[PDB]
Amino acid sequence: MKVVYDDVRVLKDIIQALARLVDEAVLKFKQDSVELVALDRAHISLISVNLPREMFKEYDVNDEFKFGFNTQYLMKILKVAKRKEAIEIASESPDSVIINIIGSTNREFNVRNLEVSEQEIPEINLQFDISATISSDGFKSAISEVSTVTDNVVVEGHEDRILIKAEGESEVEVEFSKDTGGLQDLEFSKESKNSYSAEYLDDVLSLTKLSDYVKISFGNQKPLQLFFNMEGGGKVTYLLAPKV
């Protein structure tokens, strides 16, 4: 198998999130797309990735191929990539995977393919009280700001706005609304306010580099979902357990 993607930084952004969450993970190359699902060690959160074949400059898969890897090590590799540069991932033997960053100097790494333990997760039908599409930069700024004063990020939804604020000290508050310009769309079922771990949200902020907007879904005593649509039909979701 062989895939070529035209911007390694996009994959770096995804792998950067994974490296803060789990020691090892598996990219599953299938006929129509590349898939990944990973739970953090405590099973507090879940990242899911689907990259359709149409995103790729070249895409040659015959048998489904599972590339298991250590997330720290793949980061050691992808950290050499600073620019918009293509990445090739290939394998001609089940035990080896070749990663080629093709910039100024083509740098190739022949890594041992790992057998990583996987689990039934099945499809999750989630219901939420609120969903909204908001600015990814605004969201990143809010989480970075709130995370410097509290461990708990309060997310609250109303009919015309999303507020992100520092739990029990609400002088850190980013508003997403049409007035503020941070709110693109809002679906309202019921008023909601719940807390979520700032640590875990900080872990995945590299995902905000994937799209200008993030769709956020949550509810009272419900998990929080982040969803990023990518050019070419790529999809990435992060699901984070609620605080009670």
Side-chain angles (χ1 to χ4, degrees), residues 135 138 160-162 173-183:
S135 167
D160 65 45
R161 64 191 170 292
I162 296 300
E173 281 176 13
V174 192
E175 171 188 312
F176 302 78
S177 67
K178 288 194 190 314
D179 181 286
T180 288
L183 212 240

Side-chain angles (χ1 to χ4, degrees), residues 23-36:
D23 301 346
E24 306 189 346
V26 176
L27 279 162
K28 179 181 211 184
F29 295 82
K30 290 174 66 158
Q31 244 66 213
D32 304 319
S33 65
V34 188
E35 296 188 8
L36 172 149

Side-chain angles (χ1 to χ4, degrees), residues 14-27 36-49 67-76 114 116-119 121 199-200 203-204 238:
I14 287 169
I15 301 309
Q16 281 175 349
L18 284 176
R20 309 261 304 253
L21 298 175
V22 73
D23 301 346
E24 306 189 346
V26 176
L27 279 162
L36 172 149
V37 186
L39 278 88
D40 64 89
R41 169 179 189 79
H43 290 201
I44 281 168
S45 71
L46 179 153
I47 288 171
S48 184
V49 177
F67 169 32
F69 59 87
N70 181 278
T71 60
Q72 171 186 167
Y73 192 100
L74 190 57
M75 270 308 308
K76 191 173 79 198
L114 300 182
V116 185
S117 303
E118 292 172 283
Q119 170 146 15
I121 350 165
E199 173 183 356
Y200 276 85
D203 284 345
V204 297
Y238 183 60

